[PDB]
């Protein structure tokens, strides 16, 4: 199952890819919340 | 077959964790879209 252990390693690695992507998405999303928060405080 | 079993369980759990995170982000994202369209009118 060298084949199976490589697939599992690629899955775990891809889940780290996805986790880092949504962590980065969250930091950008937080900026847009604050930006809107800034605008609505003005109106 | 305990080794592979708990790893597969951990992977399935991590897929639920990422799905729940993405669903919670979608709620926040939609709320930002709402704030946009309200500001665009005022």
């Amino acid at each position: 199952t060298v084949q199976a252990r490589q697939l599992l390693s690629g899955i775990v690695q891809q889940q780290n890819n996805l986790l880092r992507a949504i962590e980065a998405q969250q930091h950008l999303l937080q900026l847009t919340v604050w930006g809107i928060k800034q605008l609505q405080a003005r109106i | 077959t305990v080794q592979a079993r708990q790893l597969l369980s951990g992977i399935v759990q991590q897929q639920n964790n990422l799905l729940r995170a993405i669903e919670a982000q979608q709620h926040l994202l939609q709320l930002t879209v709402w704030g946009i369209k309200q500001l665009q009118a005022r």
Binding site: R5, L8, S9, V12, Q15, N16, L19, I22, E23, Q26, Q30, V33 | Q3, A4, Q6, L7, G10, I11, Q13, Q14, N17, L18, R20, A21, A24, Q25, H27, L28, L31
Partner: peptide, 29 residues
């Protein structure tokens, strides 16, 4: 609004913990 930002924070911490566990289990295997 504040609800979702705080929920996301908890959800990301749990995913980071599970990622560490899976990577430990991967290497032991």
């Amino acid at each position: 609004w504040q609800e979702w930002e705080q929920k996301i924070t908890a959800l990301l911490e749990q995913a980071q913990i599970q990622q560490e566990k899976n990577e430990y289990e991967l290497q032991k295997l």
